[PDB]
């Protein structure tokens, strides 16, 4: 039943701006954390963005900090990821991920990404 | 007063006057330079590094109208951290901790802070701290530090210190992980001494952190009128952080106890092993030596000459004695 | 800013063999790492988080371990569906960095 | 239990009261007569000056430091109507804490403790409290007590001590005693930490003697705080007429305090017991190391010193003895046997 949806992808002209849309089903965006991870063709994966709507705090990747803007809302169970100042090195596959926190010690709490999506080309 | 600082390498005086419009920077070493900023009504931050220069720090302490007791507490280094409350000012002492590889022991440096009216004083014993992130945050107008008062800076310094505690806790967590893995793989003397020093360091860390949660609870509940109410919940947050820190220390200590006791009570068993190794060889081989001294006799007459095939006989006797002496044992696990 | 190196670049083995992939952390990370597999043209699958706790539903033959600051993802016996790309991730703080990605190859 | 009367001790005249301590240096009488308006501090040595304060309406605190002068204690008891057996209990020092309820006064015996570093001696001192009418008599041994905070509170109107009568003063005295029992337990915890460290790393005769001294000190502490829980329980549960019903809840809290102390002491005992065991293990470890070398050589040369002996045979019959060699074979045999022992001792290393 639970699954994660992605949208907003497609061919991009250099120098433009585009917004990726992430839909959900079987679960709510508010309760959990939602991450966006980029994988280059044949290269290593890179976590590009994070969002946790319920708390409201938002964090971005260092290599992208300032380039992208990520947010979400439970009104339509949606996550928006707007991107500007794009370049050719961003030609990759972008994935939505549902992440939950977990406990290893009383001072540092870990994180893990259990559910992913098919992603879209960016 | 008295002087008991460990280090005398360097001394430095720094000032920081922040505002919603402009910030003041001034690098110098003269004690007099900080006199005007004391009279300023705007909140100010003062940094003094080096407790060896007793004259200047004493002059500063008695120039701000601070009681000599706070001054001698600043000079005092070997005491548990604890916060002082007063009708006008507050005084706080902490033992900032740092850790390094190639040698396993905690490194404690005393850091003292004073909040009086609209002035914050902070004294470091040794060069090197982790108080810069708030410095470049306020310098580049990041955050909302400029808008708020000096209590913001005070608990920002406190939360930076407990973040350094978090970092040191993760380093020690690596220490327990590697020590436990090595002990499970191969329990030896060096890992056992590492366990000793880790246990001592954990005890010291406990002794330093346990007062910290009580201090933060005191600054939470007491809420003296000097500190504005708008920053009351924020201190609680740091308290929560300290709670976490305290908790993990306890767990770590428990772990090292489990890494110690099982190694101790079994040492006597080890002796038994040594016993047996020193016994069976003494059981089997010592008579043989005696035998080697008898049939190698050197009398005028040789009774062995009359004997036929005497050496097969004596070698067989020694061998069967060895066999019966080694099967005398191991019947109830001496090997 | 904590990076995460992985070794080897790629590995080759046949079915029924034990394989070890190591993950070195330049900076200290407490225990928060995760291991992923990536079949071609498919979403990544979570296998082991915390380096010693296994996800629900993954094969029981999987396992992981943590030695000092380094991490190891070991498999007692490969499978025909198991030859894939493996990935190492750390989540000490809100800034999280992935690994190089090791490719499992058939002999 | 039956009736109570003065004990008859051999070697003494009948009815003789004797101080049974070892401190005979100090004597003073400090009187604090306080009220809601103003206080009166009066330190002196004459004993007739303090006696008229028996009938004072305001609360009075009469602290006699130095009970080696039995005449002062006897005069105070004679004027205040204190039974002679109570006076003997005051003077008698070797006594666990206790409480006795009489018609006109409440008598309490409690112990202060002093523990110091660089001289590991736990020293016990006795304080006797007598709540009578509207005053509190107190008897000590030597200069130096634990009730300075109460004195400061009375002098400075800090707290709400002044409003109440002598019952709150008594509550304050026992409260200060329990608080400094807490600080004593903290000092003992620090000493336990230091001693266990030294035991774990430096095993000697002095450290096991120190451990035994600490064990005996903890035993004495148990023997002291158990009657302390008893006296506080009697205080808030028997509720004698001298104690006002308004005061009783405060004592309750002190009782809780006392319970905590007891628990800590119990815990301490367990720890110190473990400490002793650790020492034994450590000592054993040392011996093993020494014996280890004794094994190695004795497990290598003994297998060989007889082989030489087994070829130290004297004879002329067997001819293989005189077969052309540069002695390579037997030397090689002894060398490989020696390295066999070496490699066997490398596993479970013995150095
Ligand atoms: Mg011999
Ligand atoms: Mg011979």
The DSSP-derived string for D218-284 is HHHHHHHHHHHHHHHHHHHHH--TTS-TTTHHHHHHHHHHHHHHHHHHHHHHHHHHHHHHHHHHHHH
Contact across the interface for C31 and B178, Cβ inside 8 Å = no
Q: What is the spatial distance between Cα A3 and Cα A1, in angstroms, rounded to a whole number? A: 6
Q: How far is CA B59 from the centre of its chain?
A: 34
User: Hey, are the CB atoms on B288 and D281 less than 8 Å from each other?
Assistant: no
**Mutation site for C-interface testing, chosen from B171, B177, B245 by largest number of C Cβ within 10 Å:** B177
Q: Which ligand has the shortest distance to the CA of D309? A: 2
Q: Is B254 on the interface with C (CB under 8 A)?
A: no
Which residues, in sequence order, are bridge partners of residue D63? D30, D138
Q: Whose structure tokens read 């330079």?
A: B33
In this complex, do B174 and C30 lie within 8 Å of one another by their Cβ atoms? yes
Q: Across the strands, what pairs with D41?
A: D32
> In the numeric block, which tokens belong to residue B280?
């069976």
**Could you tell me which of B138, B133, B128 has the C-alpha nearest to residue B107?**
B128
Gap from CA of D332 to ligand 2 centroid (Å): 20
Q: Both tokens of residue C98? A: 């992935």
Judge: C31–A46 Cβ closer than 8 Å, yes or no: no
Task: Measure the CA–CA gap between A83 and A118, rounded to whole angstroms.
Answer: 19
Q: Does B164 touch chain A (CB under 8 A)?
A: no
- Rounded Cα gap, residues B304 and B310, in angstroms: 7
Measure the CA–CA gap between A100 and B333, rounded to whole angstroms.
Answer: 54
* Residue B131, helix vs strand vs coil: coil
Instruction: Tell if the CB–CB gap between B247 and A108 is shorter than 8 Å.
Output: no
For B236-239, the CB contacts below 8 A with 24+ separation are B237/B159, B238/B155, B238/B158, B238/B159, B238/B162, B239/B213
What phi, psi does A57 have (nearest 5°)? -70, 145
Ligand located closest to B297 CA:
2
Distance B299 CA to ligand 2 centre (A): 12
Q: For chain C, give the longest Cα–Cα distance.
A: 39
**C7, B179, B288, C12: which is closest to D308 by C-alpha?**
B288
**Looking at the domain C5-107, which fold is it?**
Immunoglobulin-like (2.60.40)
Q: How far is the CA of D330 from the centre of ligand 1 (A)?
A: 19
B164 exposure class (CB count in 10 Å sphere: 0-12, 13-18, 19+): middle
Instruction: Indicate if the alpha-carbon torsion angle B54, B60, B63, B65 is positive or negative.
Output: negative
CA distance B220 to chain C (A): 27
Strand bridging mode C19-24 / C70-75? antiparallel
Confirm if D261 and D222 have CB atoms less than 8 A apart: no
- Which chain B residues are Cβ-neighbours of A106 within 8 angstroms? 244, 247-248, 251
* Residue B169 at interface with chain A, using a CB cutoff of 8 Å: yes
How far CA B317 is from CA of B40, B299, C8, D47, in Å, comes to 105, 22, 63, 99
| Cβ-nearest to A110 among C32, C97, C101 | C32
List residues in chain A touching B: CB distance below 8 A: 105-108
Q: Structure tokens of D177?
A: 């005693």
Q: Are C51 and C71 in contact (CB under 8 A)?
A: yes
**Subunit contact A95:C46, Cβ cutoff 8 A:** no
| Distance between CA atoms of residues B192 and A122, nearest Å | 55
* Contact residues, D window 271-290, toward B, CB-based 8 Å cutoff: 277-278, 281-282, 284-285, 287-288
Check CB contact of C92 with chain B, cutoff 8 Å: yes
**Which of B10, B43, B50 has its CA nearest to residue B24?**
B43
Helix axes D70-80, D84-91, angle to 10 degrees: 150
* Chain C residue nearest residue A52, CA to CA: C94
D and A in touch (3+ CB pairs within 8 angstroms): no
Contacts of B192 (CB under 8 A, 6+ apart): B263
- Give bridge partners of residue C20 from the DSSP assignment: C74
Cα of B324 vs centre of ligand 2, distance in Å, is 26
Q: What are φ and ψ of residue D227, in 5° steps?
A: -65, -20
Distance (Å) of CA B52 to CA C79, D35, D155, D178: 68, 51, 41, 41
Cα(B221)–Cα(B232) distance, integer angstroms = 9
CA distance linking residue C14 with residue C75, whole number of Å: 12
Rounded to 10°, the helix D248-298/B267-294 angle is: 20
Under an 8 A CB cutoff, do A105 and B166 touch? no
Q: Which two tokens stand for residue B173?
A: 């967590």
Q: Which experimental approach was used here?
A: cryo-EM
* Nearest partner of C73 among C13, C19, C14, C11, judged by Cα: C19
CA nearest to D298 within chain B: B278
Closest residue in A to B166 (Cα) is A107
The domains of chain C are located at 5-107
Contact A104 C34 (CB under 8 A): no
**B244 has a chain A CB within 8 A of its CB:** yes
User: B119-124 and B44-49 as β-strands: parallel, antiparallel, unpaired?
Assistant: parallel
**Number of Cβ atoms within 10 Å of the Cβ of D5:** 9
Q: Which ligand is nearest to the CA of D310?
A: 2
How far apart CA D91 and CA D68 sit, in angstroms, is 8
Pairing of strands C10-12, C102-105: parallel
Q: How far is CA D82 from the centre of its chain?
A: 31
The shortest C-alpha distance from A62 to chain B (Å) reads 17
Q: Tell me whether residues B173 and A106 touch, CB distance under 8 A.
A: no
**E runs forming strands in chain D:** 28-33, 40-44, 60-65, 98-101, 105-116, 119-132, 135-140
Token pair, residue D200, equals: 């774990």
d(CA D55, CA A46): 89
- Crossing angle between the packed helical segments D166-201 and B189-221, to the nearest 10 degrees: 160
Closest-CA distance of chain A to residue C51, Å: 11
Residue B218 sits at the chain A interface (C-beta within 8 Å): no
- Residue D176: CB atoms within 10 A of its CB come to 19
* Probe site for chain A from B173, B206, B241 (most A CB atoms < 10 A): B173
Taking alpha carbons only, the member of C68, C94, C2 closest to residue B171 is C68
Give me the sheet containing B84-85, strands edge to edge.
B24-28, B12-17, B44-49, B119-124, B107-116, B89-98, B84-85
In this complex, do D313 and B305 lie within 8 Å of one another by their Cβ atoms?
no
Distance B287 CA to ligand 1 centre (A): 9
Using the beta-carbon criterion (under 8 Å), do C98 and A46 form an inter-chain contact? yes
Query: In this structure, which ligand is nearest to the CA of B289?
Result: 1
Among B44, B221, B22, B14, CA closest to B117: B44
CA-nearest of D40, D48, D66 to D138 is: D66
Query: Looking at beta carbons, which residues of chain B come within 8 Å of A108?
Result: 166, 169-170, 173
Task: List Cβ<8 Å contacts ≥24 apart for B36-42.
Answer: B38/B63, B38/B64, B38/B119, B41/B118, B42/B17, B42/B18, B42/B118
């Amino acid at each position: 039943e639970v699954q994660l949806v992605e949208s907003g992808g497609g061919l991009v002209q250099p120098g433009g701006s585009l917004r990726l849309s992430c839909a959900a089903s079987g679960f709510n965006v508010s309760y959990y954390s939602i991450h966006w991870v980029r994988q280059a063709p044949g290269k290593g994966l890179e976590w590009v963005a994070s969002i946790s709507s319920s708390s409201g705090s938002t964090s971005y990747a260092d290599s992208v900090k300032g380039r992208f803007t990520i947010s979400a809302d439970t009104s339509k169970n949606t996550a928006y990821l707007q991107m500007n100042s794009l370049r050719a090195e961003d030609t990759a596959v972008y994935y939505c991920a549902r992440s939950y926190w977990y406990y290893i010690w009383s001072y540092s709490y870990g994180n893990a990404m259990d559910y992913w999506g098919q992603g879209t080309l960016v | 007063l008295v002087y008991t600082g460990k280090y005398r390498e360097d001394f430095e005086i720094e000032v920081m006057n922040y505002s919603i419009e402009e910030f003041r920077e001034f690098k110098t070493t003269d004690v007099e330079s900080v006199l005007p900023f004391r009279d300023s009504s705007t909140p100010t931050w003062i940094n003094i590094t080096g407790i060896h220069r007793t004259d200047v720090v004493q002059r500063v302490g008695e120039f701000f109208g601070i009681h000599p007791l706070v001054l001698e507490d600043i000079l005092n280094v070997h005491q548990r951290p604890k916060v002082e409350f007063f009708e006008n000012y507050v005084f706080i002492v902490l033992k900032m901790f740092t850790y390094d590889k190639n040698l396993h022991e905690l490194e404690s440096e005393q850091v003292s802070l004073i909040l009086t009216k609209n002035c914050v004083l902070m004294f470091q014993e040794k060069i090197g701290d982790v108080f810069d992130p708030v410095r470049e945050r306020i310098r580049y107008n990041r955050g909302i530090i400029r808008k708020k008062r000096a209590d913001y800076l005070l608990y920002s310094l406190i939360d930076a210190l407990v973040d350094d505690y978090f970092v040191l806790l993760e380093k020690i967590d690596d220490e327990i992980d590697v020590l436990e893995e090595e002990v499970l793989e191969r329990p030896e003397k060096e890992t056992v001494q590492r366990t000793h020093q880790l246990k001592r360091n954990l005890v010291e860390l406990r002794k330093t952190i346990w007062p910290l949660r009580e201090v933060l609870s005191s600054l939470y509940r007491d809420v003296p009128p000097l500190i504005e109410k708008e920053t009351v919940p924020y201190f609680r947050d740091v308290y929560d952080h300290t709670i976490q820190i305290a908790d993990t220390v306890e767990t770590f200590r428990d772990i090292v106890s489990g890494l110690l006791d099982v190694y101790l009570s079994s040492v006597s068993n080890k002796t038994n092993e040594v016993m047996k190794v020193l016994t069976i060889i003494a059981t089997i081989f010592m008579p043989l030596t005696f035998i080697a001294g008898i049939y190698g006799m050197n009398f005028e007459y040789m009774p062995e000459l009359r004997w036929k095939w005497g050496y097969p006989v004596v070698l067989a006797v020694m061998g069967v004695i060895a066999v019966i002496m080694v099967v005398y044992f191991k019947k109830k696990k001496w090997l | 800013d904590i990076q995460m190196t992985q070794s080897p670049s790629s590995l080759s083995a046949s079915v029924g063999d034990r394989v070890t992939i190591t993950c070195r952390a330049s900076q200290s990370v407490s225990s928060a790492v995760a291991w992923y597999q990536q079949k071609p043209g498919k979403a990544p699958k979570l296998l082991i988080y915390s380096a010693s706790s296994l996800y629900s539903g993954v094969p029981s033959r999987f396992s992981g371990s943590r030695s000092g600051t380094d991490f190891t993802l070991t498999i007692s016996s490969l499978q025909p569906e198991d030859f894939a790309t493996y990935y190492c991730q750390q989540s000490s703080s809100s800034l999280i960095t992935f690994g190089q990605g090791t490719k499992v190859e058939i002999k």
